[PDB]
Amino acid sequence: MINAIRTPDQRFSNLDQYPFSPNYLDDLPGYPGLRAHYLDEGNSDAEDVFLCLHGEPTWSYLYRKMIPVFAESGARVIAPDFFGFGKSDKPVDEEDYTFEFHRNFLLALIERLDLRNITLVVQDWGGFLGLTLPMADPSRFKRLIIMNACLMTDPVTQPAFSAFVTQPADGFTAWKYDLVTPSDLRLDQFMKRWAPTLTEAEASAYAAPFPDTSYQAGVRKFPKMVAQRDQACIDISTEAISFWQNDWNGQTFMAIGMKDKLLGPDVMYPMKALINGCPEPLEIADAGHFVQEFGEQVAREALKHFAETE
């Protein structure tokens, strides 16, 4: 039904610092015959569950440094790869990818696995999407760990969440340009540019999922989605705001990658205010858009702030 392709297993043979066994789901309601990859780490019977959501143009490999810390704290860690990324199947048409197709996969994943006591860990699109989930079933979510992300609302209700799109020229505009224009997109090169401390092994872990351009419709659509927000995205992100603001009564931990030219301080401070109970943020001076590449620290600190309330 949905036309898609699978990256060959051999492409991940040699991953650096990714000894996590794959778990797959190919029987999700609404995603018939579409195989979803997810990591399931730590005690599966854990009371607490860390749901790690990635963004553009990454995968669960991005949480590799955080997974072990949360796992060793006694928690179960779920880190799914969105359709189109990592080890999941990749629809070939850009048209197939929408906000709801990604948001509905997540709700379906959460129901199938029957996840409760969720500690939501988001960044980028893991955040644009992630942050609109608790409102569809608030009993499942207990805490939030938020890194450089925001809500895809309209330009009017939250200008701080729309302004980076146009300025600066070396922020979102250049990131976008890098992603949707080359006809030979090398993710390793793109990552080394946007996450400068990555080693060479690391960066190729990022290109692993896409042998050629036919595997990158999904990577190409995300950016266009931030730039051209559909009505359901807008309505949904807009309702989320209200949830964060009046209904959320969970524990929150915020971390900011201060060198981010996209979702920096100028986006995170105003998000901080919409989140009821949001403490003061952990500013990571050396971190850029991929705060997870400085994950150990963010994970230790967070479990640290959360335990000082149990």
Coordinates of C-alpha atoms in Angstrom, one line a residue:
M1 CA 0.0 0.0 0.0
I2 CA 2.4 2.8 1.0
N3 CA 5.4 2.5 -1.3
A4 CA 8.5 2.2 0.7
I5 CA 12.0 0.7 0.8
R6 CA 14.3 -0.8 3.4
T7 CA 17.9 0.0 4.0
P8 CA 19.9 -3.2 3.7
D9 CA 21.1 -4.6 7.1
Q10 CA 24.8 -4.7 6.0
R11 CA 24.8 -0.8 6.1
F12 CA 24.8 -0.9 10.0
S13 CA 27.4 -3.7 10.5
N14 CA 30.1 -1.4 11.6
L15 CA 28.3 1.2 13.7
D16 CA 30.4 3.0 16.3
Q17 CA 29.0 2.8 19.8
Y18 CA 25.6 1.3 18.9
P19 CA 25.5 -2.2 20.5
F20 CA 21.7 -2.0 20.8
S21 CA 19.6 -4.9 19.5
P22 CA 16.9 -4.0 17.1
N23 CA 13.2 -4.5 17.9
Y24 CA 10.8 -4.1 15.0
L25 CA 7.1 -3.6 14.6
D26 CA 5.4 -4.1 11.3
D27 CA 1.8 -4.5 12.4
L28 CA 0.9 -1.0 13.5
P29 CA -2.7 0.1 12.9
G30 CA -2.6 2.6 10.0
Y31 CA 0.9 1.5 8.9
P32 CA 0.2 -1.8 7.2
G33 CA 3.4 -3.7 6.2
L34 CA 5.6 -0.8 7.3
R35 CA 8.4 -2.0 9.6
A36 CA 9.3 0.3 12.4
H37 CA 12.6 -0.1 14.3
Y38 CA 12.9 0.9 18.0
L39 CA 15.4 0.2 20.7
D40 CA 14.1 -1.3 24.0
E41 CA 16.8 -1.0 26.6
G42 CA 17.0 -1.6 30.4
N43 CA 14.5 -3.6 32.6
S44 CA 11.4 -4.0 30.5
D45 CA 9.4 -4.3 33.7
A46 CA 10.6 -1.0 34.8
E47 CA 8.1 1.3 36.4
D48 CA 9.7 4.3 34.5
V49 CA 10.0 4.6 30.8
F50 CA 12.2 7.1 28.9
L51 CA 10.8 7.7 25.4
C52 CA 13.6 9.2 23.3
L53 CA 12.5 10.9 20.2
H54 CA 14.9 12.0 17.5
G55 CA 14.7 14.7 14.8
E56 CA 16.1 15.8 11.5
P57 CA 18.1 14.2 9.9
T58 CA 19.1 11.7 12.6
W59 CA 17.8 8.4 14.3
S60 CA 18.0 6.7 17.6
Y61 CA 21.8 6.6 17.1
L62 CA 21.6 10.1 18.3
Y63 CA 20.7 9.0 21.9
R64 CA 23.5 6.4 22.1
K65 CA 25.2 8.3 24.9
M66 CA 22.1 8.9 26.9
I67 CA 20.6 5.4 26.7
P68 CA 23.1 3.7 29.0
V69 CA 22.8 6.3 31.7
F70 CA 19.0 6.1 31.9
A71 CA 19.2 2.3 31.6
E72 CA 21.6 2.0 34.6
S73 CA 19.1 4.1 36.7
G74 CA 16.6 1.3 36.5
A75 CA 14.5 2.6 33.7
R76 CA 13.3 1.2 30.5
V77 CA 14.3 3.2 27.4
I78 CA 12.4 3.3 24.2
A79 CA 14.0 5.0 21.2
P80 CA 12.2 4.7 18.0
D81 CA 13.3 5.6 14.5
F82 CA 10.7 7.5 12.5
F83 CA 9.5 6.1 9.2
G84 CA 12.1 7.4 6.8
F85 CA 15.1 7.3 9.2
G86 CA 17.4 4.8 10.9
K87 CA 16.4 1.2 10.6
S88 CA 12.7 1.9 9.9
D89 CA 11.1 1.5 6.5
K90 CA 11.3 4.6 4.3
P91 CA 8.3 5.7 2.2
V92 CA 9.6 6.8 -1.2
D93 CA 7.3 9.6 -1.7
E94 CA 7.7 13.0 -0.1
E95 CA 3.9 13.5 -0.2
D96 CA 3.3 10.6 2.3
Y97 CA 5.2 12.4 5.0
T98 CA 3.0 14.8 7.0
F99 CA 2.9 15.8 10.6
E100 CA 0.0 13.5 11.4
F101 CA 1.7 10.5 9.7
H102 CA 4.5 11.0 12.2
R103 CA 2.4 12.0 15.1
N104 CA 0.0 9.0 14.6
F105 CA 2.9 6.5 14.4
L106 CA 3.9 7.6 17.8
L107 CA 0.5 7.3 19.4
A108 CA 0.2 3.9 17.8
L109 CA 3.6 3.0 19.1
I110 CA 2.7 4.1 22.6
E111 CA -0.6 2.1 22.6
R112 CA 0.9 -1.2 21.1
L113 CA 3.7 -1.2 23.7
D114 CA 1.3 0.1 26.4
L115 CA 3.8 2.7 27.7
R116 CA 3.1 4.3 31.0
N117 CA 5.1 6.4 33.4
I118 CA 6.7 8.1 30.4
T119 CA 9.5 10.5 30.7
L120 CA 9.5 12.2 27.4
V121 CA 12.9 13.1 25.9
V122 CA 12.7 15.4 23.0
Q123 CA 14.7 17.7 20.6
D124 CA 14.0 19.2 17.2
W125 CA 11.2 17.4 15.4
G126 CA 11.3 14.9 18.3
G127 CA 10.1 17.9 20.1
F128 CA 7.7 19.5 17.5
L129 CA 5.9 16.1 17.4
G130 CA 6.5 14.9 21.0
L131 CA 5.3 17.9 22.6
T132 CA 1.7 17.4 21.1
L133 CA 1.4 13.9 22.5
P134 CA 0.6 14.3 26.2
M135 CA -2.5 16.0 25.5
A136 CA -3.9 12.9 23.7
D137 CA -3.6 10.8 26.9
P138 CA -2.1 12.8 29.8
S139 CA -2.2 9.8 32.3
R140 CA 0.7 8.1 30.4
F141 CA 3.1 11.0 30.9
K142 CA 4.9 11.9 34.1
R143 CA 8.1 13.9 33.1
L144 CA 9.7 15.8 30.4
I145 CA 13.3 16.3 29.4
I146 CA 13.4 19.0 26.7
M147 CA 16.3 20.1 24.6
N148 CA 16.4 22.7 21.7
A149 CA 12.8 22.3 20.4
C150 CA 9.5 24.3 20.3
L151 CA 6.0 24.1 19.0
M152 CA 5.1 24.5 15.3
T153 CA 2.5 27.1 16.1
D154 CA 1.5 30.1 13.9
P155 CA 3.5 33.2 13.4
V156 CA 1.0 35.1 15.4
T157 CA 0.5 33.2 18.6
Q158 CA 4.3 32.6 19.1
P159 CA 6.6 34.7 16.9
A160 CA 9.7 33.2 18.6
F161 CA 8.7 29.9 17.0
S162 CA 8.5 31.3 13.6
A163 CA 11.2 33.9 13.5
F164 CA 14.3 31.6 13.1
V165 CA 12.9 30.4 9.8
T166 CA 14.0 33.6 8.1
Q167 CA 16.8 34.8 10.3
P168 CA 19.7 34.4 10.5
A169 CA 20.8 33.5 7.0
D170 CA 23.3 31.0 8.5
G171 CA 20.6 29.3 10.8
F172 CA 17.5 27.5 9.5
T173 CA 17.9 29.1 6.1
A174 CA 21.3 27.4 5.6
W175 CA 20.3 24.2 7.3
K176 CA 17.4 24.0 5.0
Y177 CA 19.3 24.8 2.0
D178 CA 21.9 22.0 2.9
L179 CA 19.1 19.5 3.1
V180 CA 16.6 20.0 0.3
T181 CA 18.8 21.2 -2.5
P182 CA 21.8 18.9 -3.1
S183 CA 21.0 16.1 -5.5
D184 CA 23.7 14.1 -3.7
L185 CA 23.1 14.7 0.0
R186 CA 25.8 13.3 2.1
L187 CA 24.6 13.1 5.7
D188 CA 28.0 12.5 7.1
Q189 CA 29.2 15.8 5.6
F190 CA 26.1 17.6 6.7
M191 CA 26.5 16.3 10.2
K192 CA 30.2 17.2 10.5
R193 CA 29.2 20.7 9.6
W194 CA 26.4 21.0 12.1
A195 CA 27.9 18.8 14.9
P196 CA 31.5 19.7 14.6
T197 CA 32.8 17.5 17.4
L198 CA 31.6 14.3 15.7
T199 CA 34.4 11.9 14.8
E200 CA 34.4 10.4 11.3
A201 CA 32.9 7.1 12.5
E202 CA 30.1 9.0 14.2
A203 CA 29.3 11.0 11.2
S204 CA 29.1 8.0 8.9
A205 CA 26.6 6.4 11.4
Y206 CA 24.4 9.3 10.3
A207 CA 24.7 8.5 6.6
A208 CA 24.4 4.7 7.2
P209 CA 20.6 4.7 6.7
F210 CA 20.6 6.2 3.2
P211 CA 22.6 4.4 0.5
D212 CA 21.4 6.7 -2.2
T213 CA 18.9 9.5 -2.6
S214 CA 15.9 7.3 -3.1
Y215 CA 16.1 6.6 0.7
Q216 CA 15.9 10.3 1.6
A217 CA 12.2 11.5 0.9
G218 CA 11.6 11.8 4.6
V219 CA 14.8 13.7 5.3
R220 CA 13.9 16.0 2.5
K221 CA 10.3 16.7 3.7
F222 CA 11.0 17.7 7.4
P223 CA 12.5 21.0 6.5
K224 CA 9.7 21.9 4.1
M225 CA 7.3 21.1 6.9
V226 CA 8.8 23.6 9.2
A227 CA 8.7 26.2 6.5
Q228 CA 5.2 25.4 5.3
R229 CA 3.0 24.5 8.2
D230 CA -0.3 22.7 7.3
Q231 CA -3.5 23.6 9.2
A232 CA -3.7 20.4 11.3
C233 CA 0.0 21.0 12.5
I234 CA -1.0 24.5 13.5
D235 CA -4.2 23.5 15.2
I236 CA -2.5 20.7 17.0
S237 CA 0.6 22.6 18.1
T238 CA -1.6 25.4 19.1
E239 CA -3.8 23.1 21.4
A240 CA -0.5 21.7 22.9
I241 CA 0.4 25.2 24.2
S242 CA -2.6 25.2 26.4
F243 CA -1.7 21.7 27.7
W244 CA 1.8 22.8 28.6
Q245 CA 0.5 25.9 30.2
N246 CA -2.5 24.8 32.3
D247 CA -2.7 21.0 32.5
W248 CA 0.8 19.8 32.8
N249 CA 1.7 19.0 36.4
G250 CA 4.8 16.8 35.7
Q251 CA 8.5 17.3 36.5
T252 CA 10.4 19.0 33.8
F253 CA 14.1 19.4 33.0
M254 CA 15.4 21.7 30.3
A255 CA 18.8 21.7 28.6
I256 CA 19.9 24.3 26.0
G257 CA 22.7 23.9 23.4
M258 CA 23.8 27.5 23.4
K259 CA 25.6 27.6 20.0
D260 CA 22.4 26.5 18.3
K261 CA 21.6 29.0 15.5
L262 CA 18.2 27.4 15.0
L263 CA 16.5 26.5 18.4
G264 CA 18.7 28.5 20.8
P265 CA 17.9 30.7 23.8
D266 CA 15.7 32.9 21.7
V267 CA 13.3 29.9 21.2
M268 CA 14.0 28.0 24.6
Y269 CA 13.4 30.9 27.0
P270 CA 10.0 31.6 25.6
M271 CA 9.3 27.7 25.6
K272 CA 10.4 27.7 29.2
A273 CA 7.7 30.1 30.1
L274 CA 4.8 28.1 28.5
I275 CA 5.8 24.9 30.4
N276 CA 4.1 24.9 33.7
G277 CA 6.7 24.2 36.5
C278 CA 9.7 24.4 34.2
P279 CA 12.7 25.0 36.4
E280 CA 15.8 26.9 35.4
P281 CA 17.6 25.5 32.4
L282 CA 21.0 23.8 32.1
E283 CA 22.9 25.9 29.6
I284 CA 25.4 23.8 27.8
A285 CA 27.8 26.3 26.4
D286 CA 29.7 23.9 24.0
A287 CA 26.6 22.3 22.5
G288 CA 25.1 23.2 19.1
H289 CA 21.7 21.9 17.8
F290 CA 22.5 18.3 18.7
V291 CA 22.6 18.6 22.5
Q292 CA 22.5 14.8 22.6
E293 CA 26.1 14.6 21.4
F294 CA 26.7 16.1 24.9
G295 CA 24.1 13.6 26.2
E296 CA 25.8 11.9 29.2
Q297 CA 25.9 15.2 31.0
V298 CA 22.3 16.0 30.1
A299 CA 21.2 12.6 31.2
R300 CA 23.1 12.5 34.5
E301 CA 21.9 16.0 35.4
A302 CA 18.4 15.2 34.6
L303 CA 18.1 12.0 36.6
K304 CA 19.7 14.1 39.3
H305 CA 17.0 16.9 39.3
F306 CA 14.3 14.2 39.1
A307 CA 15.5 12.2 42.1
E308 CA 15.6 15.3 44.2
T309 CA 11.8 14.8 43.9
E310 CA 10.8 11.2 44.7

